[PDB]
Design a binder for this molecule. Structure first.
Ligand SMILES: Cc1onc(O)c1C[C@H](N)C(=O)O
Length: 261
């Protein structure tokens, strides 16, 4: 019998945000954003009803060292708390081993965020100096990228980050943005290009993306391994993309409402 599909996502603008009069609303009505629109498109196409719920620990998802327990949205799927994850969750090897991913609905890569004027234009620049600190988001693909990389420049950046004091790692993207904006150029943030270019179009328009991306990957709609939803969700993403819906949604939340020109 038909049952409401539990969707796990995360409060990360502009993917999922609280609507202005959210205190008055209930259920899915409380939220708005790219993934809120995407979730509606996928549901309509796959013919199911859903319930959006913000991940409890507010994390994307990593396997805890020692306990070996997955947290974040990935954990929700692994331990059976949610039927599907619709958010800017990166497709990775270690995640693909425990959960399923549809083909990408958005392409991206790790990038460098700086406060305008900062004397840095590449990862190599960051790795060769010590005056400007830099870090990443915790519990996700970005931190794991530097921890696993065998590439010289990235390995050197990891070696420095992992033992920096005070910590250069943040719990949420907003925490990293605020750290860049209030550090007078003494902090650079490593985050995915999607998020970097989004913040580049927001007041006070004081941040900027420098250099090219360090890698190339994508976000995928995830489901518990072997879930019956997988096939239809994948086809839905491919169709939505071919119809131009996805390009339309990104303009809607990124550029249409741009605040810096
Ligand atoms: C969004 C976002 O932007 N930079 C990042 O590290 C992230 C999280 C990343 N998508 C993950 O799955 O861990």
């Amino acid at each position: 019998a038909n049952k409401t599909v539990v969707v796990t996502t995360i409060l990360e603008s502009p993917y999922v945000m609280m609507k202005k009069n959210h205190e008055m609303l209930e259920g899915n009505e409380r939220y708005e954003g790219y993934c809120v629109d995407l979730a509606a498109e996928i549901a309509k196409h796959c013919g199911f009803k859903y319930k959006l719920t913000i991940v409890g620990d507010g994390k994307y998802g990593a396997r805890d060292a020692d306990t070996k327990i997955w947290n974040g949205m990935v954990g929700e799927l692994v331990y059976g708390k949610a039927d599907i994850a619709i958010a800017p969750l990166t497709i990775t090897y270690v995640r693909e081993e425990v959960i399923d991913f549809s083909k990408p609905f958005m392409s991206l890569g790790i990038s460098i965020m700086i406060k305008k004027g900062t004397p840095i234009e590449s990862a190599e620049d960051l790795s060769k100096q010590t005056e400007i600190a830099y870090g990443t988001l915790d519990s996700g693909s970005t931190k794991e990228f530097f921890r696993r990389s065998k590439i010289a420049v990235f390995d050197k950046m990891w070696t420095y980050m992992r033992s920096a004091e005070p910590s250069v790692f943040v719990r949420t993207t907003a925490e990293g943005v605020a750290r860049v904006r209030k550090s007078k150029g003494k902090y650079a943030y490593l985050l995915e290009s999607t998020m970097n270019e989004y913040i580049e179009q927001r007041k006070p328009c004081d941040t900027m993306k420098v250099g090219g991306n360090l890698d190339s990957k994508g976000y995928g709609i995830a489901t518990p391994k072997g879930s019956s939803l997988g096939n239809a969700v994948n086809l839905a993403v491919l169709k939505l993309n071919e119809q131009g819906l996805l390009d339309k949604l990104k303009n809607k939340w990124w550029y249409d409402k741009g605040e810096c020109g």
